[PDB]
Design an enzyme around this catalytic site. Structure first.
Site, short mmCIF file in Angstrom:
data_model
loop_
_atom_site.label_atom_id
_atom_site.label_comp_id
_atom_site.label_asym_id
_atom_site.label_seq_id
_atom_site.Cartn_x
_atom_site.Cartn_y
_atom_site.Cartn_z
N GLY A 1 4.57 -56.58 -38.03
CA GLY A 1 3.62 -55.72 -38.56
C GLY A 1 2.82 -55.37 -37.40
CE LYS A 2 1.49 -49.31 -35.81
NZ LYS A 2 2.08 -48.22 -35.36
CB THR A 3 -0.41 -52.20 -41.26
OG1 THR A 3 0.74 -52.62 -41.75
CG2 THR A 3 -0.20 -50.54 -40.98
CB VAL B 1 10.79 -53.67 -32.80
CG1 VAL B 1 10.91 -54.35 -31.55
CG2 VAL B 1 11.35 -54.38 -33.95
CG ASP C 1 4.00 -53.02 -32.53
OD1 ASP C 1 3.03 -52.16 -32.98
OD2 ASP C 1 4.23 -53.66 -33.67
CB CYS D 1 -0.77 0.13 1.23
SG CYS D 1 -1.95 -1.46 1.36
#
Ligand SMILES: [Zn+2]
Ligand SMILES: [Zn+2]
Ligand SMILES: [Zn+2]
Ligand SMILES: [Zn+2]
Ligand SMILES: [Zn+2]
Length: 1830
Positions: free
Chosen positions: A1107-1109, A1104, A1102, A138
């Site tokens: 495959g994933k697709t 490695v 994953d 103040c």
DNA sequence: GTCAGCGCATGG
DNA sequence: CCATGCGCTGACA
């Protein structure tokens, strides 16, 4: 006499350390104050605050109210009207501690008619106030905008009194002017805090102003209410093992271990440090911390080393200079209590002229308690401002935030004095209500209705068992068993605290002193491992509280007995007693023991367990030692007794002891004996014998008369035989000095073993100083105890020497010995123990049946306890006739402390510990009383968050009026004290219920509750690691693709199961818990609301795989013909299409992936780029069986615009680039809009994904999603939801809640206190102010968070699967080829390492410099890191190959020892360059000086620097460096005086004062340059000596003979040799560890090198040249060559490097071998052609980078050096990336990885550290290890 | 944007 | 002639 009273402690005053007692004394001094209560007539004094911070005026006023009530029996009520605070954490601190009716945000708008509160309510300003206090913001001048707002308010409402408090140096005269402009008379004084009762020395300025001689009277009266301090600061501190202090210490350790250390520049203050050490004749030693340059510090055992590792070198060297300054006065810090505020310069440092004071603890403070060895914690900093901290309520505030509150507060005693004087002076200007009767009627009815309401909360007691009654039980096994368990459970290291345990304890051989291994190196006792078996302190706590009675009583003591004891001790040959001392002693003892009912308080684990029993006039403590445990009785001196009175001195030490019978099964059995107060003095003879040692001062390094002072090693004490008869224990003998065993001034002696005294405990003789006395007061002592003692505790003592005697070389002297307090026994004294029942609920859940809905208003009972008390000496806590609340938020801690004797006996109450309650509640219910709804957030535009004012008002109001979940009540009816405890369950249930979000799942909410007993805290804890279950041992299923891959089938099965959900009406059950805990009893009651949800999805991750697709499209083509939902929502269109969302560069690879496996199995409508949705049409877009999207589509603004058009929002609305909380809220409103639209309504030109419901959504990465499209992918709706990923985000709770949000599961809610601080800040960047307030107002515990993490871990076990590279389905093994760098090669690594240490450099600086010569010199100094930045990066390459520069094609060393010649020449040239820079700058300075002298008359920097530097006899550093410096300065033409004729260099670049400033700065530069020169010459000497010894000829003999010690292989030792790394000297290893233990080199005269034990390098370690062969290459490369030549021919290799400078060297190295290699680099795109060339036997051993596919064709992998990264996450990522490159799949051969590492080198270090941290922090798993054969 | 090095002033 | 002041600016992330 008032200014000299605050110099030192006033002895003639009483001691006073309690705030309430201070205010009692104050209100006593001024009796005119009653007139104020008389002026008001029942009216309530209305008080306002502005920016006070700790609301200290309110505490002051409350305590004045209590004092005036007790003193005059009148009532003065006060009414806190409003307050103002602008920092959210300060606001929340207020709101928790004080609950003000209004709490405004900013003061600037107080002049207006409406203002915002901390909630956002927008209430109107209150109005008339009878007194206003302000401060710390103040007075904003030094723009000052807040002062103007305060003045606007003061002008609008005219308050009779205004008080301001702020810093001393502020524009106070402007304040007086402004007040005068607004018609206010004003005055201001400076008031010292140490002048109102408190030992803190802090000066402030207060100002008083009133509407228009009153301020002058106010000033005089305030100055009249002055009373000096009389208690030391240590009465206000907490104990160093107390839970809050220890929590601070553990947080330090945790922060350090959870996690470099770059050097700050402080040359300008280093000059002052040096001039101090030189001017006060201190040494250049660092005794407290052994801090070092480019390294670490290690303090004494007890000193909070994790704090000392966190400060800079200036602060640490200030600590050194301060301890050295006190040691020059005879005082040993560490054993005397003082505080230091080292935050400032060394020259303006008066820590405290008198030790009991604390210096001003400023907002930016670096405080240090000498005894504690660490900082002043924020709570203690508060308690020194007059704030009673026993019930402070703090939640999650930094030490600097708490230091800020404490630094800016105002002391309660000073505000109390100022407000007392204000109210007494202006007492008439305050109006009076003068309508008292009505007010009295109202207040009495208020208390009446309240008393009813409190009498009816707890509903129940019917199922209470009321079964048992128990007290005074002593389950007693055996006393020796108890002593044995005690000795093994107590505290072994200071870092253990009350409840911790540490590994690797060591115990000293003489003066057995225990410390762990991490601590306990600075003071080096003769240590050995401890042969103890650690037992938990909680377990022993149980058995020890079993043995003890909960109340005890001493009887059989009366006048005639004491008279008999006295007359017998006088009949025996003991001290006679003075009649007056006996009178006082006997009177006090008897008036204390009489009617004494000692009650149990607490145990304390402190290297010796102790039980504390407290009565009204005495304390009784059972010390439980290893040998001879006993009870100790201590009688309390009256509180109204001076500091130097005799009585107070007589009652300091226990006057009665009780030694237990070890064979006795009883705990209170043996005989009592009393300590008669007889003072006796006797002569004695001390004599020194043996070899003599350096004294304490000399061993510290002091260089005054303290240089080479000697002290004896053994003292021999000979007493008159009659004195050995008089004394109880014989003291004569010889005491051998134990110098390495730490004590006051290293004065610990040990009595040598004697006859007939074998069974007794060991007796020591050392110096025991008082905590606040003076040095002349201290005196040596004879005692059997040697531990550190708390405050207020005293150690048993046999005798006390004179104060004169100090260790020295004097032969023998006759001094007076003080034996006093003879121990005599009386058989009359006796110790004894002392229908109290208790009720618990019979069976759990019978309560839960007994409760209803809408029971929030009541608290079901849990316990009730009746106990026979007694009317006289029964405290005020038990209200007579009627129940009384406890109001635990303000009195719980002090209440449950007096109920310890009752509670500790109680059984645990564990019947109700499992979730049990009613269920099936309504989905839509908000109790609206236990859980009010938070207001809605509005957005202004640059985007600002808003709050609904009406919603915020209702929320704040209802939030105030919430029922507390626990209730404690007490009453006293006819001398029986009963108390009950209630738990408002339905409140907890309703809160947990309200938190859970609304949904439509046709599942019902169930409710539960439980109470967990005897819990403890969980504060400093490492983070959890979330582990993922793999897709294994799950069935395989067959499937029109050409192949099926086996392990791909086992995961297809799991995907199908998650999809189909046979049976399984619910898959998950969202949980939501709301906790409450009663701390003092250790009870945590929590209520749970949970409902199940069915979600048909999964997350696969994953790293490695093959495959994933293929598995995903297998799932699709499998489920191609099934109806997915039974329910379909009418708003959204349905499609059989499956949508995939992929970051975009793989949108080309996906449809070509599906092309091969399933050829035209169905239609694909792959889209790419925003202008693909425009050409399509819903019917054409329909009847597809797959869709491919690009995540970038959601970045196209045309997408959002079309969504807007379809949602029918304002066309500009929903537009933002950032996509944050604003965007998400907006899009959610638009989502409701778009659904409601598509409800109504044929083929259409432009579809948008969000308008129709999909069957199956797949996200291809989920972590590329850049937060603008993460919203879009979360809002997308479908029947099944999958995620595909390479690596899942599972680091913490938020990452997993993101996966759950995508799934559709409310896994949790954020509290904004769970993450790390870094994530917390990013969250905060968008929070409203009211939210930053609400985050500090409420917190949650650690167990709450732990439960949430467990819930997330379960979510991971149910949904997320990580298929990882398979062991034994792909055979893998790791080999490690560690070698030793040959002699001449390792020598260069050693030189580079120590050269980079000396020149304190670790990294190149990217920031450019404004001054040009500055950047020039900086580069000249950085030339050392020639290859690159980050000295570790250079060291790694030097492990890889020997060369000075790997980027310079000028000098190449055809062998080692030629690179050594290169390096010697280079360092010589750099030394010359630095001398030439020095000479240039000296000439410039001579110019400046002459230019000043020619115009000036003529302390002076440069003249003094020249005088001191020209003297070869004084120099810190080498003597050869000083030779070089003097040669330069003689060549500069100086003959010990400045020369008018210059060197012809440019003179004075260049009003007089400014250029004098320039000359000063040039002097500083010069000092820096001399220091760098010293470092250079030292490093050169080290390297030349190393090479010389390493050659091994007679040249090696020349130096190895020339040792500094005098022990040489030449006379006839064949012992050992070692050299230092800091310098180049070599003496003898044994005769070197001694000097290195004392921070000194062997030649203390010539070099001042700051030696540590890590600098010693054994000669044998260096090696001998001609041992190994490194003809022309590095050892690492040659071993790589051998390695590749080792393995079979058909196998293909792969190599990994980190630095590209080494690509050429390794390629050359292997071309020297017969191996043909292939390097991918050099081509931006034919790199892929290289991987095609790698796939004809065209290539083998292909090389590639560490950081840049499936190179499966090769099986071997080779790692040169370890990957060097800043973070562990990135390290593990890159290491698994590289290893997976060879370990993918399709591997026929077993994988091998080889890691070449250099022994005793930095790569060994990085390997070891990263391996260690990978095991804990990650739950990463190792590879097998097999020794490789080819 | 944040924090530690860096500095003689000032009232009595 | 002593006891006591309590932040700022400039280098850096
Ligand atoms: Zn320890
Ligand atoms: Zn020891
Ligand atoms: Zn409720
Ligand atoms: Zn020697
Ligand atoms: Zn040396």
């Amino acid at each position: 006499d008032i200014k000299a009273a605050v110099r030192n402690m006033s002895d003639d005053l009483p001691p006073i350390s309690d705030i309430e007692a201070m205010f009692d004394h104050l209100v006593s001094r001024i009796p005119d104050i009653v007139e104020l209560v008389r002026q008001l007539n029942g009216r309530k004094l209305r008080v306002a605050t502005m920016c006070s911070g700790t609301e200290s005026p309110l505490l002051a006023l409350n305590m004045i109210a209590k004092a005036i009530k007790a003193q005059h029996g009148l009532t003065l009520a006060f009414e806190h009207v409003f307050s103002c605070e602008i920092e959210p954490f300060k606001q929340a601190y207020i709101e928790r501690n004080f609950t003000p009716p209004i709490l405004f945000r900013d003061v600037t708008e107080l002049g207006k008619k409406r203002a915002h509160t901390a909630y956002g309510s927008m209430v109107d300003v209150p109005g008339d106030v009878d007194i206003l206090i302000a401060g710390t913001s103040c007075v904003d001048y030094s723009s000052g905008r807040t002062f103007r707002g305060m003045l606007q308010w003061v002008k609008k409402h005219q308050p009779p009194i205004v008080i301001l408090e702020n810093v001393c140096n502020a524009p106070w005269d402007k304040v007086v002017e402004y007040f005068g402009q607004i018609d206010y008379d004003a005055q201001y004084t400076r008031l010292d805090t140490k002048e109102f009762y408190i030992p803190h020395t802090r000066t402030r300025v207060y100002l008083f102003a009133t509407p228009s001689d009153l301020p002058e009277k106010w000033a005089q009266t305030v100055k009249d209410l002055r009373r000096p301090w009389s208690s030391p600061f240590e009465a206000f501190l907490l104990h160093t093992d107390d839970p809050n202090i220890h929590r601070a210490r553990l947080e330090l350790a945790s922060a350090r271990a959870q996690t470099s250390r770059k050097t700050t520049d402080w040359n300008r203050c280093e000059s002052r440090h040096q001039r101090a050490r030189q001017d006060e004749a201190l040494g250049l030693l660092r005794p407290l911390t052994s801090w070092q340059e480019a390294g670490v510090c290690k303090g004494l055992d007890w000193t909070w080393n994790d704090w000392l590792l966190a400060q800079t070198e200036r602060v640490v060297d200030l600590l050194e200079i301060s301890t050295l300054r006190m040691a020059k006065d005879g005082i040993d810090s560490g054993f005397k209590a003082c505080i230091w505020n080292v935050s400032q310069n060394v020259d303006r440092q008066t820590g405290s002229s008198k030790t009991a004071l604390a210096p001003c603890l400023t907002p930016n403070m670096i405080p240090w308690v000498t005894i504690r060895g660490g900082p002043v914690t924020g709570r203690e900093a508060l308690a020194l401002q007059g704030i009673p901290v026993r019930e402070l309520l703090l939640t999650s505030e930094n030490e600097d935030q708490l230091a800020d509150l404490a630094g800016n507060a105002m002391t309660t005693t000073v505000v109390g004095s100022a407000m007392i004087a204000a109210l007494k002076v202006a007492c008439h200007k305050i109006t009076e209500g003068a309508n008292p009767e009505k007010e009295a009627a109202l207040i009495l009815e208020k208390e009446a209705v309240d008393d009813e309401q409190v009498a009816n909360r707890i509903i129940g007691e019917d199922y209470l068992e009321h079964h048992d009654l128990d007290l005074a039980k002593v389950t007693k096994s055996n006393l020796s068993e108890i002593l044995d368990l005690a000795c093994r459970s107590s505290r072994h290291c200071q870092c253990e605290g009350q409840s911790g345990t540490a590994p690797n304890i060591l115990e000293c051989q003489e003066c057995s002193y225990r410390a762990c291994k991490s601590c306990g190196g600075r003071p080096e006792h003769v240590y050995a491992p401890c042969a103890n078996q650690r037992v938990e302190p909680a377990e022993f706590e149980k058995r020890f509280k079993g043995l003890l009675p909960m109340r005890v009583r001493i009887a059989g003591l009366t006048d005639q007995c004491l008279n008999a004891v006295r007359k017998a001790a006088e009949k025996s040959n003991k001290g006679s007693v003075n009649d007056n001392d006996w009178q006082l002693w006997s009177t006090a003892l008897l008036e204390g023991i009489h009617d004494a009912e000692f009650r149990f308080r607490y145990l304390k684990r402190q290297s010796t367990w102790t039980a504390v029993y407290e009565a009204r006039r005495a304390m009784l403590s059972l010390v439980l030692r290893n040998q001879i445990p006993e009870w100790r009785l201590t009688i309390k001196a009256p509180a109204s007794e001076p500091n130097n009175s005799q009585l107070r001195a007589l009652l300091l030490h226990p006057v009665a002891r009780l030694q237990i019978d070890i064979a006795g099964q009883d705990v209170l059995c043996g005989p009592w004996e009393l300590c008669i107060p007889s003072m006796k003095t006797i002569d004695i003879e001390i004599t020194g014998k043996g070899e003599l040692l350096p004294s304490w001062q000399a061993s510290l390094g002091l260089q005054g008369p303290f240089a080479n002072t000697t002290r004896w090693s053994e003292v021999e004490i000979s007493l008159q035989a009659e004195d050995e008869n008089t004394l109880d224990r014989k003291l004569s003998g010889t005491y051998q000095l134990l110098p390495r065993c730490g004590q006051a001034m290293s004065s610990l002696h040990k009595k040598r073993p004697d006859l007939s005294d074998d069974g007794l405990p060991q007796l020591y003789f050392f110096l025991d100083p008082t905590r606040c006395g003076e040095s002349r007061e201290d005196r040596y002592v004879f005692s059997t105890s040697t531990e550190r003692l708390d405050y207020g505790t005293e150690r048993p003592v046999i005798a006390r020497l004179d104060s004169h005697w100090r260790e020295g070389n004097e032969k023998q002297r006759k001094v007076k010995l003080d034996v006093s307090g003879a121990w005599v026994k009386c058989p009359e004294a006796h110790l004894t123990a002392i229908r109290a029942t208790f009720a618990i609920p019979s069976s759990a859940s019978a309560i839960s049946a007994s409760l209803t809905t809408e029971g929030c208003s009541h608290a079901m009972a849990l316990l009730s306890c009746r106990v026979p008390l007694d009317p006289t000496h029964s405290e005020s806590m038990w209200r007579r006739g009627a129940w009384a609340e406890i109001d635990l938020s303000h009195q719980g801690n002090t209440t449950f402390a007096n109920l310890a004797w009752i509670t500790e006996r109680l059984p645990p109450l564990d019947g109700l510990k499992n979730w049990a309650h009613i269920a099936d509640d309504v989905s839509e219910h908000v109790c609206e009383r236990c859980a009010p709804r938070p207001p809605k957030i509005h957005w202004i535009k640059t985007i600002i968050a808003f709050e609904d004012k009406l919603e915020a008002g209702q929320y704040e109001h209802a939030l105030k009026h919430r029922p507390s979940p626990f209730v404690v009540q007490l009453r006293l009816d006819q001398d029986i004290g009963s108390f009950r405890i209630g738990l408002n369950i339905v409140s907890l249930a309703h809160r947990a219920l309200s938190r859970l979000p609304p949904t439509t799942s046709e599942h019902k909410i169930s409710l539960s509750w439980r109470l967990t007993p005897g819990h403890v805290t969980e504060s400093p804890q490492p983070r959890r690691v979330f582990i993922l279950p793999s897709n294994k041992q799950d069935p395989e299923n067959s499937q029109f693709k050409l192949p099926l891959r086996k392990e791909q089938l086992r995961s297809l099965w799991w995907m199908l199961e998650q999809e189909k959900a046979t049976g399984k009406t619910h898959t998950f059950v969202e949980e939501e818990i709301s906790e409450s805990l009663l701390p003092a009893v250790g009870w945590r009651a929590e209520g749970k609301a949970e409902r199940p949800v069915m979600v048909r999805g999964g997350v696969i991750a994953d790293q490695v795989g093959y495959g994933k697709t293929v598995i995903s499209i297998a799932l699709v083509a499998q489920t191609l013909s099934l109806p997915a939902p039974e329910p379909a929502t009418p708003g959204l269109i349905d499609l059989k299409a499956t949508l995939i969302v992929v970051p975009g560069h793989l949108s080309k690879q996906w449809p070509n992936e599906i092309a091969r496996f399933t050829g035209s199995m169905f239609k694909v409508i792959v889209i790419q780029g925003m202008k693909d949705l425009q050409e399509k049409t819903i019917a054409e877009l329909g009847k597809a069986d797959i869709i491919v999207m690009a995540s970038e589509i959601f970045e196209s603004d045309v997408y959002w615009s079309r969504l807007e058009y379809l949602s029918a929002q304002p066309r500009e609305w929903l537009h933002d680039t950032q996509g944050g909380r604003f965007f998400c809220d907006r899009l959610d409103a638009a989502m409701e809009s778009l659904v409601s639209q598509t409800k109504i309504l044929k083929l259409l030109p432009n579809p948008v994904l969000h308008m129709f419901r999909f069957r199956r959504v797949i996200a291809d990465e989920f972590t590329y999603l850049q937060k603008k499209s993460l919203a879009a992918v979360l809002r997308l709706s479908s029947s099944y939801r999958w995620i595909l990923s390479g690596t899942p985000p599972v680091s913490d709770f938020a990452a997993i809640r993101s996966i759950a949000t995508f799934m559709g599961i409310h896994l949790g809610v954020e509290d904004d206190g769970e993450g790390d601080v870094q994530y917390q800040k990013a969250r905060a960047k968008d929070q409203t102010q009211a939210e930053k307030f609400h985050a500090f107002r409420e917190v949650h515990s650690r167990a709450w968070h732990n439960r949430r993490d467990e819930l997330a871990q379960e979510f991971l076990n149910v949904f997320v699967r990580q298929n990882i590279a398979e062991i034994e389905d792909i055979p893998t093994v790791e080999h490690i080829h560690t070698f030793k760098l040959p002699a001449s090669e390792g020598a260069v690594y050693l030189e580079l390492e120590h050269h980079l240490q000396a020149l304190e450099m670790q990294a190149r600086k990217e920031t450019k410099f404004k001054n040009v010569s500055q950047g020039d010199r900086n580069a000249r100094l950085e030339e050392a890191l020639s290859d690159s930045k980050t000295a570790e990066e250079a060291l790694l390459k030097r492990c890889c190959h020997f060369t000075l520069d790997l980027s310079d094609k000028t000098q190449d060393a055809k062998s080692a020892q030629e690179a050594c010649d290169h390096i010697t020449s280079a360092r010589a040239r750099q030394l010359l360059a630095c001398q030439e820079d020095l000479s240039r700058s000296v000439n410039q300075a001579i110019a400046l000086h002459g230019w000043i002298k020619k115009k000036g008359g003529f302390r002076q920097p440069f003249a003094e620097w020249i005088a001191f530097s020209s003297n070869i006899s004084k120099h810190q550093g080498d003597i050869e460096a000083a030779r070089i410096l003097l040669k330069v300065i003689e060549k500069c033409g100086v003959k010990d005086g400045n020369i008018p004729p210059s060197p012809s260099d440019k003179q004075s670049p260049s009003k007089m004062d400014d250029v004098k400033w320039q000359l000063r700065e040039q002097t500083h530069l010069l000092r820096k340059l001399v220091k760098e020169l010293v470092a250079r010459v030292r490093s050169l000497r080290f390297f030349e000596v190393v090479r010389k010894i390493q050659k091994g000829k007679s040249d090696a003999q020349i130096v190895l003979e020339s040792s500094e010690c005098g022990h040489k292989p030449s006379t006839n030792p064949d012992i050992e040799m070692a050299i230092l790394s800091c310098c180049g000297h070599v003496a003898c290893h044994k005769c070197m560890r001694k000097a290195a233990a004392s921070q000194r080199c062997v030649k203390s005269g010539e070099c001042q090198a700051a030696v540590r034990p890590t600098n010693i390098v054994k000669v044998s370690s260096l090696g001998v040249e001609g041992e190994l062969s490194s003809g022309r290459y590095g050892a690492k490369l040659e071993h790589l060559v051998n390695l590749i030549h080792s393995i079979p021919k058909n196998e293909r290799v792969l190599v990994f490097l980190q630095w590209e400078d080494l690509a050429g060297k390794v390629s050359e190295a292997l071309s020297a071998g017969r191996i043909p290699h292939v390097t991918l680099s050099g081509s931006a795109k034919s790199r892929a052609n290289t991987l095609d060339r790698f796939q004809a036997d065209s290539a083998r051993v292909l090389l590639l980078k560490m950081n840049d596919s499936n190179l499966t064709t090769a099986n071997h992998a080779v790692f040169l050096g370890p990957l060097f990264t800043n973070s562990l996450f990135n390290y593990r990522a890159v290491e698994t990336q590289a290893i997976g490159r060879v370990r993918r799949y399709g591997q026929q051969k077993k994988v091998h990885i080889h890691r070449l590492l250099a022994l005793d080198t930095i790569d060994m270090t990085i390997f070891n550290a990263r391996r260690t941290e990978l095991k804990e922090k990650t739950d990463w798993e190792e590879i097998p290890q097999e020794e490789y054969k080819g």
